[PDB]
């Protein structure tokens, strides 16, 4: 009847790994001393949990450690506008009552959840499907009316909206299907037979050279003489390609009192 | 180092891994929170020995206790009582909140931070579940009519009818005829 | 998916719900907290969540995963990287199936057709 | 012009507006229109600001 | 489909290539109220 141990216990083989995040000499020396006497030290605290004993988290000196919250620009002012920028400081300064309040969930992520419908409403749905596959849809009127009556209205609204969402997602997935299965002009008339016997590694740096000059030793033996000659050849080709240039279009956002178009920004200011 | 993390898994088969780290025999008899009691209880035991320091000057022990209080206040936070709570970062394990996993409202309060909408209201489903009245004991010595009446009451057996919601007591609703004297605020 | 290095913040804020999180750009200041020497190109620091990924590698090369990687400059990078890809995965999904929730979408507050005005 | 083009989100309560479930039972089946995504809001002449 | 019926109207694949030019719209957390003192 031995207590159960978690996977982390087999990595360290002890319950007393004195992990302190503060990288000061006083702290790491004391931890090494405390890490060695943890077997016979009464002032020992566990950091690896077990079935029989809970544990503490990572230590920060005498206090406890927690990562800096992910940057969040949302804040709430009290006295004056602070213009809080989470990217201007490494560690987030504490929130003073008269200065700022930060957003909730210092350590939180975005997820999607769903409420659990009432148990009696679920049993009426089970009875409808069961009577459906057995007796057919046309003979499930009594089971359908029990749903509309026993299930509270807030649940019927959820059921009504689930159908509209999945109908929306169904279209969003089929539009991606259409864009994905579209045959571009550079693949017209090409099939699996015209495919090359290559794998992912054949498009990597070892087999496919990147578009940079110093990725390998290709251009390491080039001299200034060869460069001046190459500049002359590229300029020769430009004697035939520069003949064409796109025409300047009108500025759709010329009027400042008009909602501008979110047009692609220029590469450079 | 990534391969050193998987050393105990290469020597094992999949069935051995599950029986080892996943199918741990249930045993809910241990005092898991002894780790926190020993650590935090040591402050009180340490104060017993520290309050007896042979330091002669009274104001020199004022400095020692000021340093000792700083060690505690790193965990307790607020020195005043009935003001706040301490802050302890603990390890995450499968036995966190193990005895309250059956309750749904406890999960929503701990896990979910809901985003308020323009129609600023609590979700209707959450409001509807909240109206299903909880069970409130009849025993009441705070209302003097019951303090007298319940002395002559006969406790009869409530034979189980096969449900989990038998209202054999009063209900925790302000509009219940046996709870209207209770102030719900 | 974002097919650029820069994105408009307002495009990832909600229009009919309270805004409690933003989608900030990479925190370039965390790159100066690495005490060791490393090579980083400026062409990779703007793309979302990749800077925190490269930093985690640099920290996992200089140090390991035991008793030396456990320093504040290296753990915050690992936490940021893990958190950045989770938030971006959810925002990307929310943009794919719930584009009407965000500012800039023409479906957050649809403009009616002229046939609906009765003129 | 900026404050003329400064609107608030969500408009007014749709529940205070005529329902489509009621028009059906009244004898008129409404036709569903799409969103007009090609119009750009602009401010009027200065005299009307 | 797999012993399940999902009633949906006729899908129009032409809606995929719908030209929707993006328009500018900025949200200002911190702005103006209706009345001031």
């Amino acid at each position: 009847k031995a207590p159960g141990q978690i996977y982390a216990y087999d990595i360290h083989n002890t319950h007393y790994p004195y992990v302190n995040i503060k990288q000061d000499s006083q702290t790491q020396l004391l931890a090494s001393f405390r890490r060695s006497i943890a077997s016979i030290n009464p002032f020992s605290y566990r950091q690896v949990p077990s079935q029989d004993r809970a544990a503490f988290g990572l230590r920060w000196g005498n206090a406890w450690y927690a990562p800096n919250p992910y940057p969040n620009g949302i804040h709430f002012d009290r006295v004056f506008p602070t213009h809080y920028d989470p990217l201007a400081e490494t560690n987030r300064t504490k929130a003073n009552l008269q200065l700022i309040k930060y957003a909730p969930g210092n350590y939180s992520t975005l997820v999607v959840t769903s409420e659990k419908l009432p148990r009696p409403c679920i049993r009426t749905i089970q009875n409808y499907r069961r009577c459906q596959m057995v007796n057919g849809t046309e003979k499930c009127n009594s089971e359908a009316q029990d749903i509309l009556a026993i299930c509270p209205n807030w649940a019927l609204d959820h059921m009504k909206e689930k159908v509209r969402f999945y109908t929306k997602a169904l279209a969003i997935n089929n539009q991606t299907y259409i864009r994905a299965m579209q045959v571009e002009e550079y693949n017209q008339g090409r099939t699996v037979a015209d495919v090359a016997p290559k794998t992912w590694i054949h498009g990597t740096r070892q087999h496919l050279r990147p578009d940079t000059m110093w990725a390998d030793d290709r251009y390491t033996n080039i001299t200034q003489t060869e460069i001046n000659e190459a500049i002359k050849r590229v300029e020769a080709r430009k004697a035939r390609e520069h003949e064409k240039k796109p025409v300047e279009q009108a500025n759709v956002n010329a009027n400042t009192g008009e909602q501008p178009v979110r047009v692609e920004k220029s590469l450079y200011p | 180092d990534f391969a050193e993390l998987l050393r105990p898994l290469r020597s094992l088969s999949f069935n051995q891994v599950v029986d080892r780290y996943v199918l741990i025999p249930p045993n809910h008899t241990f005092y898991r929170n002894w780790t926190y009691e020993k650590f935090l209880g040591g402050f009180g035991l340490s104060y017993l020995i520290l309050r007896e320091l042979p330091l002669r000057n009274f104001y020199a022990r004022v400095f020692v206790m000021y340093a000792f209080a700083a060690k505690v206040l790193d965990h307790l936070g607020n020195p005043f009582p009935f003001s706040g709570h301490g802050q302890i970062v603990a390890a995450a394990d499968r036995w966190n909140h193990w005895d309250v996993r059956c309750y749904d409202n406890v999960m929503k309060a701990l896990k979910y931070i809901r985003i308020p909408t323009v129609q600023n209201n609590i979700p209707e489903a959450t409001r509807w579940y909240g109206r299903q009245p909880g069970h409130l004991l009849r025993a009441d010595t705070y209302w003097i009519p019951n303090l007298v009446s319940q002395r002559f009451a006969k406790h009869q057996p409530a034979h189980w009818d096969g449900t989990q919601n038998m209202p054999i007591f009063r209900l925790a609703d302000p509009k219940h005829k046996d709870s209207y004297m209770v102030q719900f605020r | 998916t974002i097919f650029a290095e820069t994105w408009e913040a307002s495009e990832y804020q909600y229009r009919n719900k309270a805004n409690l999180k933003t989608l900030p750009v990479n925190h370039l200041g965390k790159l100066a907290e690495l005490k060791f020497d490393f090579v980083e190109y400026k062409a990779h620091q703007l793309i979302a969540c990749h800077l925190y990924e490269r930093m985690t590698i640099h920290c996992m090369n200089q140090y390991g995963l035991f008793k030396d990687f456990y320093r504040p400059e290296c753990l915050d990078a690992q936490y940021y990287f893990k958190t950045c890809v989770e938030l971006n995965a959810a925002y990307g999904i929310q943009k794919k199936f719930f584009p009407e929730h965000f500012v800039g979408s023409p479906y957050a507050r649809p403009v009616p057709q002229f046939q609906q005005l009765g003129l | 012009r900026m404050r003329y083009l400064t609107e608030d989100p969500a408009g007014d309560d749709p529940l205070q507006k005529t329902k489509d479930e009621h028009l059906v039972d009244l004898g008129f089946i409404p036709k569903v229109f799409g969103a007009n995504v090609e119009v750009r809001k602009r401010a009027p002449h200065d005299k009307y600001l | 489909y797999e012993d399940f019926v999902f009633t949906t109207p006729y899908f129009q694949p032409e809606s995929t290539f719908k030209s929707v030019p993006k328009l500018f719209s900025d949200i200002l957390l911190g702005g103006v109220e209706w009345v001031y003192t």
């Binding site: 506008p81 213009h83 909602q259 501008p260 | - | 805004n19 | 400064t6 989100p9 969500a10 | 200002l28």
Partner: peptide, 23 residues
Amino acid sequence: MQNTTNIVHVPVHMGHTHYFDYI
């Protein structure tokens, strides 16, 4: 939802000054 929330359709530039917030 935040009381001081406004949706603007034209670009604006805010001042990065201490103790003040304006266009």
